[PDB]
Amino acid sequence: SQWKATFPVDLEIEKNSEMFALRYIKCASAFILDRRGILDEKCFKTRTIDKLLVTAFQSSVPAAKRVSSTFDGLYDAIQQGYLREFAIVFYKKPNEEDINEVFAFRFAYGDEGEIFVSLNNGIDTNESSQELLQAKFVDTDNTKQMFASTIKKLHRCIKKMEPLPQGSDASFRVSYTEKAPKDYTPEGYLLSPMFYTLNQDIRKASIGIVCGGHHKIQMLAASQYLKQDFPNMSPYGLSQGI
């Protein structure tokens, strides 16, 4: 039930920061997929992290084990400094380009300096990239508190969303840093020329940035199901694992 049952401590250390970064995106993904109704409810279990009720995959369920396992190849992508963004996108087949909702996790490594703002795809903006640059590691306890604050804000955002359309589809999409080789593909993902693009008028929400010592992870959302821009108290990649 304590932090250390789920996440590393001593987050200033590179290996602990890496492991935290991967476990964090997996944790938030389970929270999101459960609350938005993507998989059957038996794919999830509620767990406790300090004062918060969070969600985990139930790996004894095949569909959950499949989704959980997609994260394994992202660990090497994070270790090598190759993962720039992990995004969960919701759409309706057959139109895989028409993104109704996205939850994006953008990474900054060490003190990278500045990061290119994409002009034609994604969710990032000049403002979001400035916020990611300005965020800084402070200490492990502070990251415990910022995790809690961020999950609470994610919960409040999702409470303001209308339900996904019946039978929505979901995919995981990833983009890479300039260090990654030209045809880089994490295990479990497929190489794709396509990422995702959003409509100019979609409503957006900035949920928060959590930091390990060597990794900063920014969560940004966009949805047609938010009305306006926005208890749990105790060279791209594609995965169609969902």
- 3-state SS, 166-193, equals CCCEEEEEEEECCCCCCCCCCCCCEEEC
The two structure tokens encoding residue 146: 């910022």
The two structure tokens encoding residue 185: 């593909």
| Residue 238 exposure: Cα atoms within 13 Å on the Cβ side | 14
Q: Which CA distances in Å does 236 have to 83, 174, 183, 189, 226?
A: 10, 6, 9, 9, 27
The structure tokens 């703002």 sit at 117
Which segments of 37-138 does DSSP mark as H helices, in order?
Answer: 62-70, 72-79, 126-134
**Are the CB atoms for 133 and 108 separated by under 8 Å?**
yes
Resolution of the coordinates in A? 1.3
Residues 6+ apart with CB under 8 A from 15: none
Experimental method: X-ray
**What's the rounded Cα separation, in Å, for the pair 57 and 77?**
21
Backbone torsions φ then ψ of 192, nearest 5 degrees: -145, 145
**What's the rounded Cα separation, in Å, for the pair 125 and 146?**
22
Residues 6+ apart with CB under 8 A from 76: 186, 187
Q: Which CA distances in Å does 68 have to 28, 65, 193, 203?
A: 12, 5, 24, 29
88: how many CB neighbours lie within 10 A of its CB? 22
The structure tokens 């396509």 sit at 194
**What's the rounded Cα separation, in Å, for the pair 29 and 219?**
11
Rounded to the nearest angstrom, the gap between the alpha carbon of residue 116 and the centroid of all alpha carbons in its chain is 19
